From Swiss-Prot:
Top-level taxon of origin: Eukaryota
Tissues expressing the protein: Expressed in prostate and liver. According to some authors, it is not expressed in brain. According to others, weak levels of expression are measured in some brain locations. Also expressed in epithelium of the small intestine and large intestine, bile duct, nasal mucosa, kidney, adrenal cortex, epithelium of the gastric mucosa with intestinal metaplasia, gallbladder, intercalated ducts of the pancreas, chief cells of the parathyroid and the corpus luteum of the ovary (at protein level).
Summary of activators and inhibitors of this protein: Activated by cytochrome b5.
Outcome of mutating residue 144 to I: In allele CYP3A4*9
A GO molecular-function annotation: anandamide 11,12 epoxidase activity
Family: Belongs to the cytochrome P450 family.
Hydrolase recorded as keyword: no
Recorded consequence of changing residue 259 to P: In allele CYP3A4*18; exhibits higher turnover numbers for testosterone and chlorpyrifos
Cofactor: heme
Residues binding heme, per UniProt: 408
Protein's recorded name: Cytochrome P450 3A4
Length: 462
């Protein structure tokens, strides 16, 4: 069709697109399976069409460095719009160019290393709440689904970190916070909705005037109201480690508005709830099928925290094997699966002409299992991230949190949150593979990096 011969004139290989659909039919295997096959059959640079949208893939470490870091403010500044956003266009994940840069500056100090340390005692409380709910799950003598136990944990962490709500979601699934926020699940970009708007981007402005938000409108307006109360409450109840409080005090001394305040608060829930629980589920699956890793990690946790001591910001950064377990799991399962930037002008990178409007993509999943940089990619070997080999890995091939000024702003919080859970659970429980566990864990064929069957493991007390 119109914009389907763009990669032909540039001499770029790629699967031949069909009219009106591009290469969306190749998504039947999923985003990750399609990327790895394209890397095999086309090399280092290829392209395809998400409907009429041309998507160029790059794997050269210097080319990835130029897109994400070097030429970021100039050319590759924003991501591809994904659907009707509504009032959430003021979200840092969705804001573009000047709005994003102002929003990121107004939100960067919220994620300081010092501000993270002040949150450790609060996140530590629900690790004990996690163990209690895990104890009854282990005494029943039946396998436990990790997504629910971790999903209850991440919900408890997000509510207590974003706001002052302290709850036990696993035992009290009726609080209005836990009810609505449980519907903030990841976007399956290969579902009937997102596939249609990817093929039909002209429908996105139509859905906006219909006030059809991509986020559940009930959750958004409820959170828009809940924040308004808590704000007024803390005002007429002046007494704080809260993402809300860290943004309210910064509102005093461009500026952050009240609706922009709510949008970022919702982002942290959406970015934190299903994302953290998935990775924690992925980590524990690998610890069960590789008990040697689970053993050396339990020993190191006891070595740094004797008598099942409470973790600390200083002690968490001390355990070297725990960081290796998390890093390797993220390599095998980078839940982003992809990094995208919109080319805002005609620019040439590393001897490649990139026309305006093309979506440049970094296939994180395809790079993490590409043999050219990893030996035995399909095997779970945490020793790749030992101190000696930690310097022999190219940071622009292994990008679980992205790179450049638009990387994951909550990287340290997410790593701290997951490790605080792993420390408190491993030093009290051991995870054994039961019968229902899928020994060859199959990944979904959709737009999410989640397991095919929910991960169920046997839990026992030490
Ligand atoms: C293991 C957990 C997590 C992983 C693997 C992860 C991964 C990512 C990735 C790959 C990106 C895109 C970066 C890129 O485009 O270069 C991103 C963006 C982002 N993440 Fe996360 N993330 C995690 C947890 C979190 C948490 C807990 C928060 C809450 C504070 C968060 C907040 C954000 C935000 C706000 C952005 C947008 C940053 C920007 O556009 O300027 N993430 N994350
Ligand atoms: O940007 C990303 N990448 C990413 C990262 C992990 C998994 C999936 C993906 C999307 C590619 Cl399937 N996720 C994301 C998106 C939004 C919203 F789209 F709503 F703006 C809001 C928040 C986040 N988030 C989640 C975790 N960390 C940031």
């Amino acid at each position: 069709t119109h914009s389907h011969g763009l990669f032909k004139k540039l001499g770029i290989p790629g699967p031949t697109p069909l009219p009106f659909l591009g290469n969306i039919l190749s998504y039947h295997k999923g985003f990750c399976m399609f990327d790895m096959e394209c890397h095999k059959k086309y090399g280092k640079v290829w392209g395809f069409y998400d409907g009429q949208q041309p998507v160029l893939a790059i794997t050269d470490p210097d080319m990835i460095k130029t897109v994400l870091v070097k030429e970021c403010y100039s050319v590759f500044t924003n991501r591809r719009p994904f659907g009707p956003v509504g009032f959430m266009k003021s979200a840092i994940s969705i804001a573009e160019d000047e709005e994003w840069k102002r929003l990121r500056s107004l939100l960067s100090p919220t994620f300081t290393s010092g501000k993270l340390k002040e949150m450790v005692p609060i996140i530590a409380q629900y690790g004990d709440v996690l163990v209690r709910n895990l104890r009854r799950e282990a005494e029943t003598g039946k396998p436990v689904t990790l997504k629910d136990v971790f999903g209850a944990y991440s919900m408890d962490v997000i509510t207590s970190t974003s706001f002052g709500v302290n709850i036990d979601s696993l035992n009290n699934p009726q609080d209005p916070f836990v009810e609505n926020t449980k519907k903030l699940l990841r976007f399956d970009f290969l579902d009937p909705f997102f596939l249609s708007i990817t093929v039909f981007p002209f429908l996105i402005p139509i859905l906006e005037v219909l006030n059809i938000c991509v986020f559940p409108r009930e959750v958004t307006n409820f959170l828009r109201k809940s924040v308004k109360r808590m704000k007024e409450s803390r005002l007429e109840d002046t007494q704080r480690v809260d993402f809300l409080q860290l943004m309210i005090d910064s509102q005093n001394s461009k500026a952050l508005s009240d609706l922009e305040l709510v949008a970022q608060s919702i982002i942290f829930i959406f970015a934190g709830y299903e994302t953290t629980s998935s990775v924690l589920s992925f980590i524990m699956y690998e610890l069960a099928t590789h008990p040697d890793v689970q053993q050396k990690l339990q020993e190191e946790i006891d070595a740094v925290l004797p008598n099942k001591a409470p973790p600390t910001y200083d002690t968490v950064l001390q355990m070297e094997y725990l960081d290796m377990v998390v890093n390797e799991t993220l390599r095998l399962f980078p839940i982003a699966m992809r990094l995208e930037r919109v080319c805002k002008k005609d620019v040439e990178i590393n001897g490649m002409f990139i026309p305006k409007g093309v979506v440049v993509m970094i296939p994180s999943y395809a790079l993490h299992r590409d043999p050219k940089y990893w030996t035995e990619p399909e095997k779970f070997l945490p020793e790749r991230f030992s101190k000696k080999n930690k310097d022999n890995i190219d940071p622009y091939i292994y990008t679980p949190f992205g790179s450049g000024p638009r990387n994951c702003i909550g990287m340290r919080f997410a790593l701290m949150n997951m490790k605080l859970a792993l420390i408190r659970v491993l030093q009290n429980f051991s995870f054994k593979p039961c019968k229902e566990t899928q020994i060859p864990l199959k990944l979904s064929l959709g737009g999410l990096l989640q397991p095919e069957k929910p991960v169920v493991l046997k839990v026992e007390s030490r």
